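Notebook, bench 3.
Goal today: get a predicted structure for bile salt activated lipase from Homo sapiens so we can plan the truncation constructs. The sequence was checked against the plasmid map this morning, with no discrepancies at the termini. Length recorded as 533 residues. Pasting the sequence as submitted so the record is complete.
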Amino acid sequence: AKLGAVYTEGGFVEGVNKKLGLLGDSVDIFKGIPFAAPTKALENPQPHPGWQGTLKAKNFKKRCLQATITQDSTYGDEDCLYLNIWVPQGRKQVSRDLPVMIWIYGGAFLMGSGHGANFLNNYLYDGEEIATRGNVIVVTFNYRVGPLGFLSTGDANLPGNYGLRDQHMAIAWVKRNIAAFGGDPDNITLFGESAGGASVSLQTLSPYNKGLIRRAISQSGVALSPWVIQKNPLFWAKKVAEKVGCPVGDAARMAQCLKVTDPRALTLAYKVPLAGLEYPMLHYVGFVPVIDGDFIPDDPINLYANAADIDYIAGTNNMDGHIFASIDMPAINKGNKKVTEEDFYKLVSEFTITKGLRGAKTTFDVYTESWAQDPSQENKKKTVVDFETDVLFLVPTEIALAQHRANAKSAKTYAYLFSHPSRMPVYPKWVGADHADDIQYVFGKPFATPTGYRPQDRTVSKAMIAYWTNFAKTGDPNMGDSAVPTHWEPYTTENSGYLEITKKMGSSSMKRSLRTNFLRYWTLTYLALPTVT
């Protein structure tokens, strides 16, 4: 079929019908639809005026102004609030009442875009595969990142979270306009990975979204992950100020100077160091969401009631912390490099800053019990990985899973562990998936570009897309248009089980207590420890 021209609040818009096979099936593709007025530096996103006639939505638009790969130069543009839609069309009647999935990309909050991940093959967030295979509409979009999206003074001079508002603007635009495209506005499901999953989590927790979101999915990132909230934004806003010439004496004088400073200078202001250096990487991402008593009313841990009727899927990857570990202690991946005990303590010492040497021991005490199964070999090395996976992703996710059940009313809750491997690990037991590995399966890359994947990869992808889009459709990953290889049991304080995703989905796929030992340590004792200042 075909949609042709569609009426949106801002006016008509025309996409591109892409024939999918030869019997009539296709997909309508809109790229570059504006959901918010061009942006003013460090100012909240505003409504879009509209345009006259028909907007030709055939090409992606610029990603938001952001640092480049080498933090050498900048690419993008401040006129980036655009979104793209994919609508699976059948052979007769155009589609209607389709669940709607809105993707929110990650990138440590410093970079990314709706088309974001790309190359000479094909962009990674293309929603054609998810759209057509799950019979759902897919929206991707851009939101301000880096200083321009999260610079904040920690008060009203410069509140921060401009990026989160952009997300909000697009989710709202979808709510009021996705019907014209054949989507069910009361069935919007948000999904994202890393900063994307933290963002999905933060949006479900914000009162600004009352009545907008029906369900949500956090892939390796929830609002509780330690890297998500910037506890001392002002410090950061000063660093930028210095570098760009603004006075760092009055919070209010420096904020108006920054609003006028060249957007590009602000973007390049701060530069994250090399690769193997001084501290852990967490200590380096600074431009992030902030607890502003407005969009994020209080610490996210006290906001879950706001997600009481939002079904929720949250999970992490097998070796989610691998790559981060491999930068704070390169030894991990060298079959001839030693892993010290003093080293690992220097590290956990860093992740436990706000808890003094006390909190450094307690943590060190818990993670070290290895009766040296491998003082410096396959074991103590992996515990370095598990420390990173736990702090950055597993534990925060488990705390959010629980906090979401404990506040549930109608909301169902589901957890997962992604363990399918895409590459030979270093050690034969460290088999699994690294950070971000899940994206390509959720986006159906094994089908998109079959030639770059193994049959097993296609199998994992087909399963994950089926679960995600049955969930988007009914709130039950098990129920919908796609068969799933195995029943996925809802998370409850009691059962508190998760589904392990691998190439061999079976009944033993449903696991339970995952290191309840550390979850327990962290929540029961570390958290209640005295925060030294």
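The domain at 1-533 is CATH 3.40.50.1820 (Rossmann fold). The first strand starts at residue 5 and ends at 8.
Flagging this for group meeting.
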